[PDB]
């Protein structure tokens, strides 16, 4: 192929013309996101029954639509969570191989034959069935300060959230608040004075309220005779407060009818009035907009905000629209990256050609080359049904310094041929692809074998390396095969032949540089020599220094993700049990007041009854969004120093309750820090106080007489609270004329609500309910005064039936698998195998009985397979380059003396990463680099060009002896003549990579991992490299007589 | 998949023409094989069967028919339910049938949903919430056995 | 519709509306006084219309 | 017992709002009728599967289903993935008996 | 999938109640397998006889 | 007619405004893949361009 495209550039040209216009294709047809589906299928249920514990709602509801969810296809496990607020979530975690959309519709099948059972208010509310992966784009959010939240609620479903669905890209708009309804306030003295019940509301509400459906006039079964035929109407629903205040509930023989406004109050609320949004302490409207597949972020969200502009035009008076938050401007920061990063590159790969080759027009040949092999990676991304995201532009910043190596070689070779020889361009380019063809395929070959087990991995890890894996491959092979298509017509095409001895009449600076890189070469040649001569000693000091890296490497912390400056800062605040609202909004007015006293937050965002660790009246959640990069730059201005000014500030100013801050980290399915989670679970249903005394001695176990960091062992659910439990005396009601349906509707009518009827409100169609005038329900000594109905009529206090009283009662249920489960979150402190903690942890909880069992929550179940996998594919491709390359040198020798270089580049990396961390250490600054996957990326591109390296060495050594010379001589001169390429890609990718090295901005902890990890992988591995390839062969030569 | 879900749509359009019992129960769609692969034995010498197979159907049946392969789990019995066994001998002296039988076991015997005292919409400083529960419910024989029927 | 035709390019005879040809209905207005003045309850009527 | 203008602002409205997204959806259409009846149309694209769309939209009307009327949801929505023009038309006649 | 099902059994039998037991006396796993490594036999023998 | 009163198609005549842009296109891909594969073929740019 080499010399076939050599006669033919039009044919190669017209090559490079096909796979420019694929790339451009793929690349304007390829989705736009910040990060790529990572997580598995996962349906949730979201039930909804108010009025009611946690143990009710857990064993009326979610018990039952568990005990149906077994025998789906790919389900990995389930788990079922409730609380007091009076909802339920049935979360189905299926295998991966899964398809989402199949999942949830035989999760739905399922729901539907076991609907039935389930309570009536529970079939009147319904039970949704959604999945849980969300692609988060916007948060529009609107504040008024002149009008009720529920207004804006209101407004913002009715003109704003139809308007922002329609829009190109948008796949979902999800309003926070609830709606509103019609709700009736009703006075139980009323009641009791005219002798009336909420059952006699209950049916007014639903009797005065009722769709009538005619017919026709003339319908078809008609009479001999019938000309017309007429629809006819009849309005039987109400619409507005007066008609609802004007339902008659009991009409007397002499009148006085009793009409719904005599005994309560009507009017429009909210329907759960639980959730409330503010934003810099005005009230706020919430709406998350989720990016669809095979959609854009940048044009979506300039289209939203467009439209939001357009929408604010015709807002009323006091509105307005903020967008705080938009995950589509980290793709737009990472796209600027790359093409910084290849004007970059390709800037220093002219400087660097026209320092050292003495002319222009080799340049252009690199500059020609990359573009197409990156256009031809983006191609083969788009084929495989993939998308840009912040992984694929790393992968594709990170396979620059790759691409560009091919036609650095190609041209230096060619130019030495054409310097030496003085042959015309063509002869010179045919004898260099004469001597390098074997070489690239052979290196492609290696290149592809490398990469190939990055994309077998498991988990979200695997599919955050598949993304490298995909881009890097396709990009070397794209570059392997422009090398040797079109890199060599440019080179006979666009050159012209050098004059006999035209570089030494040359003078000025390039003579000087020309005198002082000869010199160069004659003291490196020299030092290889005497490194050839001592070869005990040198092999000993190369053993030993592969062994240090060995050791610096396995004494490395590991991880997945560095934590990330995204902009913004979660706040978690937790009251103590039976708090109102009121309090947790004076400290949520508090956390504000704090959170703008720091100039680093630009804009809070505070949620009262919502809160991550649970939903309750004292749990609250905020977000203190931080300026851009730009106006952040220093020392205690970045996401974790705000994160602790703002907990040392509420530490101290929060009386009541107390509040955490942290930093989100980056994809939460890879989430690092939360050590390892256990969820223990009952098996024979003992009960809640036996399942807790186990969790207390099994947290004792693991504190005291265990090794997971006592400092980190605690439970992580929620403990009891006080509760008002009513014991009812059956003996007590049936010595009386009261039934026991009488404390059931007296119970559901005192503190609960009521969903009884629905009614228009301007096209369409709204809750009525009843709430039962709040005012009386405040005080524990209500439901003691309850007087529930005899036979002939109500004279018992309630007192007589049943006993209140006080107790300590859960106030969140879980279960897993089916089985009552608490849930533990410790952590190993260091230095300890996180399979012995596993092991110790699982043999403690095989102490106790028989009938507790644990397991494995998050990312421990996958921590829970042998990490074999990585091994074995390893130790798959160090066999697969072993024989690509036997079959390239035609040897069982060669490929162990190539082989030899890898430990160098793993202890270059890990030195330089640990004289970071110990830099970082000394300056105050802490540790911020560790063995994470952007580590391992590095690792494989340094080692990748560390091998590529060596097998051009190894094949000039090996085709120079075949001539009739030694070991020695053979590789003194293979070194002597790869000296000057080795220098110039190194130099390239050194200052390519350095802008990468001292990263600071958006997206910097990724950057600076991956980018001290290549330089100091690249610079060691060349500089042992350099004076230890040429040894490995004399010793590998001398080692092994061939045959 | 496809079948199985177009089979779900004919039957979510008929299911509410069947009889009430018949939704009650509930129909069951499935995919499986007629043939057994395997049989499990519970062998014991210090439960009855019926303790067996209330333990097979709640620890040992879901365990197994949520393995990848498995269609169905049939076990050769039923769980474990309240039994009353009325005789009609006893029903004509006091005047009784078995709908007031039913009607006080539906009566006797429904959960209770009480609220939370301190509700989120409430007066201007309410400072404690509290969860109100009461059991209303039997679970126990002796417990059935003092249903009031009059 | 009105200007597609005599225009030598659309055919008269074929140019038609794809409505339903909105037609005349009739209209019960219930006055709940009279009703409650009255004595007749709201579910009465509902099931004679029905 | 709906208007056109019911049928569509409380039960068509709200599912072809939210039928939004679904990939390969060409366009939709609804119409209402005074009968108390609706129905909308999602005519999809080239490039798009025909159980997989059927599946998709199954799931996003499954989802909001909790917001329609409840009369709806009693006797519910039906799916039709059918065309609409006629291939043959079979005729049965007979001189013993009446249509019926 | 009779791997599958006597590897849960064999882990949940550690949950049981004192007395009880478990066994599968009737499976159809046994037969192929079996078969499997006669026929595997079978080709070794060839094998060497060739 | 004015603004806000938009126009769509319905049927065939959709596909028949889908085929206003698409001939232009189908030639210009057509002379290009000409000009490409004669000047891969017989190696030059005046044979094609002939
Ligand atoms: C890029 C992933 C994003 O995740 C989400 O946005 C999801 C969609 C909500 O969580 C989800 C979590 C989930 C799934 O929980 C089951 C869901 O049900 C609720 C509604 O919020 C978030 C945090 C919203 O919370 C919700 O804001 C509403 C205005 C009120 C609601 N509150 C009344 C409850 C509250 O939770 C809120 C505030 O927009 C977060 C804004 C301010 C952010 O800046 C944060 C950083 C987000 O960009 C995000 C976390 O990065
Ligand atoms: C896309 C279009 C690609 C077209 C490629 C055409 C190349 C044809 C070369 C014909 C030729 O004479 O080469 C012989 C060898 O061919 C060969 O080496 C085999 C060429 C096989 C075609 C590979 C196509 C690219 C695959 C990428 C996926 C000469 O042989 P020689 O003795 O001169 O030396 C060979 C050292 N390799
Ligand atoms: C890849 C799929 C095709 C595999 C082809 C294997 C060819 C093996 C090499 C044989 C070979 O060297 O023949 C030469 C190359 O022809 C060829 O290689 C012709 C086929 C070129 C690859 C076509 C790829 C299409 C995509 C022509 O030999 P010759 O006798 O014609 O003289 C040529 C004077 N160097
Ligand atoms: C000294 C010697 C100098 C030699 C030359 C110097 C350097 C030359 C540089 C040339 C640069 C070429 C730039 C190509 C423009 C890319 C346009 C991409 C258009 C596109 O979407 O893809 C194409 C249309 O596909 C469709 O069917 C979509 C329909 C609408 C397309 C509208 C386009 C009309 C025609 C425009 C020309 C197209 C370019 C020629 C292919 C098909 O691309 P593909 O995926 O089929 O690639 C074949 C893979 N085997
Ligand atoms: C080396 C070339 C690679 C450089 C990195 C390019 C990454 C840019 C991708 C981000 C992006 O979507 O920009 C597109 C503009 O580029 C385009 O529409 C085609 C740009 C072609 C770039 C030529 C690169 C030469 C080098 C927007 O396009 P879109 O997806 O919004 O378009 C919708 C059509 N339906
Ligand atoms: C479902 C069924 C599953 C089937 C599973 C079986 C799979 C078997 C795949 C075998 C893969 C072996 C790959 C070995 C690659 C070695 C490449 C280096 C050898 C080489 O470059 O020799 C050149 C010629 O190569 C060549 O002519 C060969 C070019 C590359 C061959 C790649 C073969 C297909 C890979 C896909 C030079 O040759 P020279 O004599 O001029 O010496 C030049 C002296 N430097
Ligand atoms: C004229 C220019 C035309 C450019 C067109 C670009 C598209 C190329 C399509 C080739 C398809 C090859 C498929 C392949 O290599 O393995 C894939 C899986 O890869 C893996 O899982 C491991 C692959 C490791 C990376 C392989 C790098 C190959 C680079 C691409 C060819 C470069 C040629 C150099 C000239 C197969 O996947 P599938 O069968 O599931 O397909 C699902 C489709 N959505
Ligand atoms: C983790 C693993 C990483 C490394 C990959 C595995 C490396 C294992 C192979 C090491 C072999 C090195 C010794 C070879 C050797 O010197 O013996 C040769 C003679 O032996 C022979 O004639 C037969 C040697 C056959 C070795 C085949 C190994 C296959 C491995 C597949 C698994 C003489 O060597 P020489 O240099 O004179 O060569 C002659 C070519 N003319
Ligand atoms: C893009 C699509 C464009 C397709 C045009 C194919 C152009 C082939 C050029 C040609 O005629 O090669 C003849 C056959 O050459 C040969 O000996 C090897 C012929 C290999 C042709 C490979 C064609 C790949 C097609 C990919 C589609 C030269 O004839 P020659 O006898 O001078 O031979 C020269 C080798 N020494
Ligand atoms: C509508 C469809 C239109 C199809 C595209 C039309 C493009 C016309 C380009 C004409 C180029 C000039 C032709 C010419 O004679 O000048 C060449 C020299 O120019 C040069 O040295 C540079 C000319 C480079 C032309 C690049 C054309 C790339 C087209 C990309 C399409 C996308 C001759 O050169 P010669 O080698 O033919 O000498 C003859 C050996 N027989």
Same mark, same amino acid.
């Given at each position: 192929?080499?010399?076939?495209?050599?006669?033919?550039?039009?044919?190669?040209?017209?090559?490079?013309?096909?796979?420019?216009?694929?790339?451009?294709?793929?690349?304007?047809?390829?989705?736009?996101?910040?990060?790529?589906?990572?997580?598995?299928?996962?349906?949730?249920?979201?039930?909804?029954?108010?009025?009611?514990?946690?143990?009710?709602?857990?064993?009326?509801?979610?018990?039952?639509? /568990?005990?149906?969810?077994?025998?789906?296809?790919?389900?990995?496990?389930?788990?079922?969570?409730?609380?007091?607020?009076?909802?339920?979530?049935?979360?189905?975690?299926?295998?991966?191989?899964?398809?989402?959309?199949?999942?949830?519709?035989?999760?739905?099948?399922?729901?539907?034959?076991?609907?039935?059972?389930?309570?009536?208010?529970? $079939?009147?509310?319904?039970?949704?069935?959604?999945?849980?992966?969300?692609?988060?784009?916007?948060?529009?959010?609107?504040?008024?300060?002149?009008?009720?939240?529920?207004?804006?609620?209101?407004?913002?479903?009715?003109?704003?959230?139809?308007?922002?669905?329609? @829009?190109?890209?948008?796949?979902?708009?999800?309003?926070?608040?609830?709606?509103?309804?019609?709700?009736?306030?009703?006075?139980?003295?009323?009641?009791?004075?005219?002798?009336?019940?909420?059952?006699?509301?209950?049916?007014?509400?639903?009797?005065?309220?009722?769709?009538?459906?005619?017919?026709?006039?003339?319908?078809?079964?008609?009479?001999?005779?019938?000309?017309?035929?007429?629809?006819?109407?009849?309005?039987?629903?109400?619409?507005?407060? /007066?008609?609802?205040?004007?339902?008659?509930?009991?009409?007397?023989?002499?009148?006085?009818? @009793?009409?719904?406004?005599?005994?309560?109050?009507?009017?429009?609320?909210?329907?759960?009035?639980?959730?409330?949004?503010?934003?810099?302490?005005?009230?706020?409207?919430?709406?998350?907009?989720?990016?669809?597949?095979? #959609?854009?972020?940048?044009?979506?969200?300039?289209?939203?905000?467009?439209?939001?502009?357009?929408?604010?035009?015709?807002?009323?008076?006091?509105?307005?629209?903020?967008?705080?938050?938009?995950?589509?401007?980290?793709?737009?920061?990472?796209?600027?990256?790359?093409?910084?990063?290849?004007?970059?590159?390709?800037?220093?790969?002219?400087?660097?050609?026209?320092?050292?080759? $003495?002319?222009?027009?080799?340049?252009?040949?690199?500059?020609?080359?990359?573009?197409?092999?990156?256009?031809?990676?983006?191609?083969?991304?788009?084929?495989?049904?993939?998308?840009?995201?912040?992984?694929?532009?790393?992968?594709?910043?990170?396979?620059?310094?790759?691409?560009?190596?091919?036609?650095?070689?190609?041209?230096?070779?060619? /130019?030495?041929?054409?310097?030496? %020889? #003085?042959?015309?361009?063509?002869?010179?380019?045919?004898?260099?692809?004469?001597?390098?063809?074997?070489?690239?395929?052979?290196?492609?070959?290696?290149?592809?074998?490398?990469?190939?087990?990055?994309?077998?991995?498991?988990?979200?890890?695997?599919?955050?390396?598949?993304?490298?894996?995909?881009?890097?491959?396709?990009?070397?092979?794209?570059?392997?095969?422009?090398?040797?298509?079109?890199? =060599?017509?440019?080179?006979?095409?666009?050159?012209?032949?050098?004059?006999?001895?035209?570089?030494?009449?040359?003078?000025?600076?390039?003579?000087?540089?020309?005198?002082?890189?000869?010199?160069?070469?004659?003291?490196?040649?020299?030092?290889?020599?005497?490194?050839?001569?001592?070869?005990?000693?040198?092999?000993?000091?190369?053993? #030993?220094?592969?062994?240090?890296?060995?050791?610096?490497?396995?004494?490395?912390?590991?991880?997945?993700?560095?934590?990330?400056?995204?902009?913004?800062?979660?706040?978690?605040?937790?009251?103590?049990?039976?708090?109102?609202?009121?309090?947790?909004?004076?400290?949520?007015?508090?956390?504000?007041?704090?959170?703008?006293?720091?100039?680093?937050?630009?804009?809070?965002?505070?949620?009262?009854?919502?809160?991550?660790?649970?939903?309750?009246?004292?749990?609250?959640?905020?977000?203190?969004?931080?300026?851009?990069?730009?106006?952040?730059?220093?020392?205690?201005?970045?996401?974790?120093?705000?994160?602790?000014?703002?907990?040392?500030?509420?530490?101290?100013?929060?009386?009541?309750?107390?509040?955490?801050?942290?930093?989100?980290?980056?994809?939460?399915?890879?989430?690092?820090?939360?050590?390892?989670?256990?969820?223990?679970?009952?098996?024979?249903?003992?009960?809640?106080?036996?399942?807790?005394?186990?969790?207390?001695?099994?947290?004792?176990?693991?504190?005291?007489?265990?090794?997971?960091?006592?400092?980190?062992?605690?439970?992580?659910?929620?403990?009891?609270?006080?509760?008002?439990?009513?014991?009812?005396?059956?003996?007590?009601?049936?010595?009386?004329?009261?039934?026991?349906?009488?404390?059931?509707?007296?119970?559901?009518?005192?503190?609960?609500?009521?969903?009884?009827?629905?009614?228009?409100?301007?096209?369409?169609?709204?809750?009525?309910?009843?709430?039962?005038?709040?005012?009386?329900?405040?005080?524990?000594?209500?439901?003691?005064?309850?007087?529930?109905?005899?036979?002939?009529?109500?004279?018992?206090?309630?007192?007589?039936?049943?006993?209140?009283?006080?107790?300590?009662?859960?106030?969140?249920?879980?279960?897993?698998?089916?089985? =009552?489960?608490?849930?533990?979150?410790?952590?190993?402190?260091?230095?300890?195998?996180?399979?012995?903690?596993? /092991?110790?942890? $699982?043999?403690?909880?095989?102490?106790?009985?028989?009938?507790?069992?644990?397991?494995?929550?998050?990312?421990?179940?996958? %921590?829970?397979?042998?990490?074999?996998?990585?091994?074995?594919?390893?130790?798959?491709?160090?066999?697969?380059?072993?024989?690509?390359?036997?079959?390239?040198?035609?040897?069982?020798?060669?490929?162990?003396?190539?082989?030899?270089?890898?430990?160098?580049?793993?202890?270059?990396?890990?030195?330089?990463?640990?004289?970071?961390?110990?830099?970082?250490?000394?300056?105050?600054?802490?540790?911020?680099?560790?063995?994470?996957?952007?580590?391992?990326?590095?690792?494989?591109?340094?080692?990748?060009?560390?091998?590529?390296?060596?097998?051009?060495?190894?094949?000039?050594?090996?085709?120079?002896?075949?001539?009739?010379?030694?070991?020695?001589?053979?590789?003194?001169?293979?070194?002597?003549?790869?000296?000057?390429?080795?220098?110039?890609?190194?130099?390239?990718?050194?200052?390519?990579?350095?802008?990468?090295?001292?990263?600071?901005?958006?997206?910097?902890?990724?950057?600076?991992?991956?980018?001290?990890?290549?330089?100091?992988?690249?610079?060691?591995?060349?500089?042992?490299?350099?004076?230890?390839?040429?040894?490995?062969?004399?010793?590998?030569?001398?080692?092994?007589?061939?045959?």
């Amino acid at each position: 192929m080499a010399k076939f495209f050599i006669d033919r550039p039009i044919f190669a040209w017209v090559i490079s013309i096909f796979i420019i216009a694929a790339g451009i294709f793929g690349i304007k047809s390829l989705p736009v996101s910040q990060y790529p589906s990572v997580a598995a299928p996962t349906i949730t249920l979201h039930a909804i029954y108010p009025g009611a514990s946690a143990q009710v709602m857990e064993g009326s509801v979610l018990s039952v639509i /568990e005990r149906n969810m077994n025998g789906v296809e790919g389900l990995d496990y389930m788990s079922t969570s409730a609380d007091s607020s009076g909802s339920g979530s049935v979360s189905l975690t299926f295998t991966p191989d899964t398809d989402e959309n199949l999942a949830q519709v035989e999760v739905q099948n399922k729901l539907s034959e076991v609907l039935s059972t389930l309570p009536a208010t529970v $079939q009147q509310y319904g039970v949704t069935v959604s999945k849980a992966r969300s692609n988060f784009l916007m948060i529009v959010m609107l504040s008024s300060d002149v009008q009720s939240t529920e207004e804006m609620n209101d407004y913002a479903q009715r003109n704003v959230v139809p308007e922002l669905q329609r @829009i190109e890209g948008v796949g979902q708009v999800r309003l926070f608040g609830a709606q509103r309804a019609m709700r009736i306030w009703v006075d139980p003295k009323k009641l009791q004075n005219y002798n009336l019940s909420f059952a006699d509301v209950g049916s007014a509400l639903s009797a005065q309220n009722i769709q009538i459906s005619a017919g026709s006039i003339g319908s078809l079964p008609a009479v001999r005779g019938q000309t017309v035929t007429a629809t006819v109407t009849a309005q039987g629903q109400l619409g507005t407060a /007066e008609e609802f205040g004007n339902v008659i509930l009991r009409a007397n023989t002499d009148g006085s009818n @009793i009409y719904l406004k005599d005994v309560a109050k009507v009017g429009l609320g909210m329907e759960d009035y639980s959730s409330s949004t503010r934003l810099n302490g005005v009230n706020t409207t919430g709406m998350a907009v989720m990016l669809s597949n095979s #959609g854009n972020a940048m044009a979506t969200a300039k289209a939203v905000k467009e439209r939001l502009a357009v929408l604010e035009k015709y807002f009323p008076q006091g509105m307005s629209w903020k967008t705080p938050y938009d995950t589509s401007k980290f793709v737009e920061i990472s796209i600027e990256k790359v093409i910084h990063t290849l004007i970059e590159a390709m800037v220093l790969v002219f400087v660097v050609m026209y320092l050292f080759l $003495q002319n222009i027009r080799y340049t252009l040949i690199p500059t020609i080359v990359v573009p197409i092999s990156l256009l031809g990676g983006f191609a083969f991304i788009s084929y495989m049904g993939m998308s840009i995201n912040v992984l694929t532009m790393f992968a594709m910043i990170l396979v620059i310094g790759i691409v560009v190596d091919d036609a650095i070689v190609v041209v230096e070779n060619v /130019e030495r041929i054409m310097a030496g %020889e #003085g042959l015309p361009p063509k002869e010179a380019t045919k004898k260099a692809m004469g001597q390098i063809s074997g070489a690239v395929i052979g290196i492609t070959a290696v290149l592809i074998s490398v990469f190939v087990p990055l994309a077998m991995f498991s988990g979200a890890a695997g599919n955050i390396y598949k993304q490298f894996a995909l881009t890097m491959a396709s990009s070397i092979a794209f570059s392997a095969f422009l090398a040797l298509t079109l890199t =060599p017509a440019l080179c006979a095409t666009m050159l012209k032949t050098i004059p006999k001895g035209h570089h030494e009449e040359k003078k000025g600076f390039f003579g000087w540089f020309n005198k002082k890189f000869d010199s160069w070469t004659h003291g490196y040649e020299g030092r290889v020599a005497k490194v050839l001569r001592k070869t005990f000693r040198m092999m000993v000091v190369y053993i #030993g220094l592969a062994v240090v890296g060995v050791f610096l490497f396995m004494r490395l912390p590991t991880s997945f993700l560095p934590t990330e400056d995204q902009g913004f800062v979660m706040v978690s605040v937790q009251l103590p049990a039976g708090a109102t609202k009121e309090r947790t909004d004076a400290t949520l007015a508090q956390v504000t007041q704090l959170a703008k006293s720091i100039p680093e937050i630009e804009n809070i965002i505070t949620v009262s009854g919502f809160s991550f660790s649970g939903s309750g009246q004292n749990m609250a959640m905020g977000f203190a969004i931080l300026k851009d990069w730009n106006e952040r730059t220093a020392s205690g201005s970045d996401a974790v120093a705000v994160a602790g000014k703002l907990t040392g500030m509420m530490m101290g100013t929060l009386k009541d309750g107390f509040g955490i801050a942290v930093v989100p980290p980056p994809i939460l399915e890879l989430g690092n820090g939360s050590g390892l989670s256990i969820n223990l679970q009952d098996r024979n249903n003992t009960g809640h106080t036996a399942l807790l005394a186990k969790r207390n001695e099994l947290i004792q176990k693991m504190r005291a007489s265990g090794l997971f960091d006592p400092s980190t062992v605690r439970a992580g659910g929620l403990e009891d609270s006080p509760q008002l439990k009513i014991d009812i005396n059956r003996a007590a009601a049936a010595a009386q004329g009261v039934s026991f349906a009488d404390i059931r509707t007296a119970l559901a009518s005192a503190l609960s609500s009521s969903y009884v009827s629905d009614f228009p409100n301007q096209g369409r169609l709204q809750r009525v309910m009843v709430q039962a005038d709040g005012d009386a329900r405040m005080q524990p000594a209500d439901i003691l005064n309850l007087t529930v109905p005899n036979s002939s009529g109500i004279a018992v206090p309630l007192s007589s039936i049943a006993t209140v009283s006080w107790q300590m009662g859960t106030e969140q249920s879980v279960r897993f698998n089916g089985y =009552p489960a608490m849930e533990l979150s410790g952590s190993p402190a260091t230095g300890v195998s996180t399979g012995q903690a596993m /092991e110790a942890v $699982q043999k403690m909880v095989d102490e106790l009985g028989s009938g507790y069992s644990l397991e494995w929550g998050g990312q421990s179940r996958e %921590e829970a397979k042998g990490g074999s996998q990585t091994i074995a594919l390893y130790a798959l491709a160090a066999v697969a380059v072993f024989l690509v390359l036997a079959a390239l040198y035609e040897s069982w020798s060669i490929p162990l003396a190539v082989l030899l270089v890898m430990p160098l580049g793993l202890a270059g990396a890990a030195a330089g990463v640990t004289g970071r961390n110990l830099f970082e250490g000394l300056l105050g600054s802490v540790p911020s680099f560790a063995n994470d996957i952007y580590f391992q990326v590095g690792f494989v591109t340094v080692m990748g060009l560390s091998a590529k390296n060596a097998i051009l060495i190894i094949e000039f050594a090996k085709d120079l002896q075949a001539q009739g010379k030694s070991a020695v001589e053979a590789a003194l001169e293979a070194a002597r003549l790869r000296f000057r390429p080795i220098i110039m890609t190194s130099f390239a990718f050194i200052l390519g990579v350095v802008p990468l090295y001292i990263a600071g901005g958006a997206s910097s902890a990724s950057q600076r991992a991956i980018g001290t990890t290549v330089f100091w992988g690249m610079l060691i591995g060349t500089l042992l490299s350099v004076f230890l390839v040429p040894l490995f062969y004399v010793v590998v030569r001398k080692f092994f007589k061939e045959t």
